[PDB]
Design goal:
444 residues; globular; binds flavin-adenine dinucleotide; binds the ligand CC1(C)c2[nH]c3cc(Br)ccc3c2C[C@@]23CN4CCC[C@]4(C[C@@H]12)C(=O)N3; FAD-dependent monooxygenase phqK; FAD/NAD-bd_sf; FAD-dep_Monooxygenase_BioMet; monooxygenase
Length: 444
Amino acid sequence: GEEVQVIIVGLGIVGLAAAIECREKGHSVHAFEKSNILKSIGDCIGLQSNATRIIKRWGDGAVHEALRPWIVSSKEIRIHNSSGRLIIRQDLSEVCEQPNYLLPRSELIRVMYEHALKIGVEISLGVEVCEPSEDEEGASVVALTRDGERQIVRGDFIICSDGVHSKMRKAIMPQPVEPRPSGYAAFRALVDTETLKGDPEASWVFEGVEENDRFDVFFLSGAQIALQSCNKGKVFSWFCIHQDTRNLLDVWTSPADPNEMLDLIKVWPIGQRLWSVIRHTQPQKFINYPLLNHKPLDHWVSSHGRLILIGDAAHPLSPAAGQGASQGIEDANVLATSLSLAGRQRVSLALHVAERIRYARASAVQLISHRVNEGWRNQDWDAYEPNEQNIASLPLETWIYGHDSQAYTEQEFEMVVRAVQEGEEYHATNLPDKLRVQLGIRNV
Ligand SMILES: Cc1cc2nc3c(=O)[nH]c(=O)nc-3n(C[C@H](O)[C@H](O)[C@H](O)COP(=O)(O)OP(=O)(O)OC[C@H]3O[C@@H](n4cnc5c(N)ncnc54)[C@H](O)[C@@H]3O)c2cc1C
Ligand SMILES: CC1(C)c2[nH]c3cc(Br)ccc3c2C[C@@]23CN4CCC[C@]4(C[C@@H]12)C(=O)N3
């Protein structure tokens, strides 16, 4: 008569999604997080329809109602050259037939955090989780507080949602593999809306944004730039993918030099117009984030089946991919659904089933994303004009964004159980079959 006791390590987007999914499906959750996750840091996150389909179920629609102001209203991507001439309008009608969100990461965290608290997730901030262990009966972690005190916490299993720099990862893969730099990085930030509104030279950027979010892309030699708005022009954000061979750390806090962006764009005709908006970025908010290529891990689940890596701890993707957060939300949904179908007496089975459902699909998205990091889509802009050939297509793939991970898990659960228990390979159909072999994905 006792609920499953889930421990969650890390309350980024994925840990919060896992906490909500598990709690809404009738499991007890104690989540731990080392930092004040409500602090304003980073820029905007996109959530595609594969993630919003999951979010819509939470609280009988309550979270979707809270996120309604952030539904993407762009009907097209406007693709421009280095003169700012519009070359192509790329239709988003299919991509946006179901909701997508774009919003500051800090606002998404706030909404999810408040819902988690409302539904009875137990949350402990200021806790660095250390030293996971497990056996056939249970798992435990050490909760280290800032006073140096150590508290043992026991549960049925541990969700390791501790991000790209996961220290839990070594409990599954003890040998760490460094990612390869792509040679590219992304300048990116939110624009200060207040100083933006006060600048007559930037007023053009507000045109139409109350009815359709801005989604402008500009291709210049050495730059892929996007300007976006969300929530009827309350928020503007931008990024610029550019060549960079410096030894940049993949964190969201390091100082970056705005004049590097100005130098890159000012030499092209459209540069001054782009800078009229971009210059309103606050100086300590200018981030230059390296686009690193991480290889799929061999597997995500520990030897006794009571620890699982999800989110960026398992499959980090660069922010240029568009599917990073959404794939992590799929992890949370598949894991919670698998746990609910397996039950408390079959925890290792639940985690291994979730891994077999998720691994190939997540790895395909990860491996494809290495292409946008390496600039495969760029051409010589002295000769070519940009068009749909140059837009990375992960956000446009129906096999990704149209997928219902919960329905797939319910329909396939017993077949995956059979594969796990008979020691056979499970061939998931939640990615195109030609993609496995083409990308070299090896099933777990
Ligand atoms: C500060 C920050 C800002 C970001 N801004 C953006 C952005 O603007 N755009 C974008 O596309 N992506 C951004 N990202 C990345 C994005 O959040 C992730 O790619 C994605 O949302 C899902 O990652 P995740 O939830 O698995 O991990 P993360 O979001 O990285 O969250 C991991 C969490 O685990 C916590 N943690 C780590 N180790 C421990 C431990 N031992 N004990 C307890 N807690 C621990 C961390 O404090 C963190 O809160 C940002 C990430 C961070 C950390
Ligand atoms: C993640 C991005 C920003 C994105 N985000 C979307 C959201 C929706 Br609803 C529809 C399409 C997209 C897309 C395609 C996008 C547009 N961007 C233009 C230069 C880099 C990049 C990243 C990538 C690209 O090549 N394709």
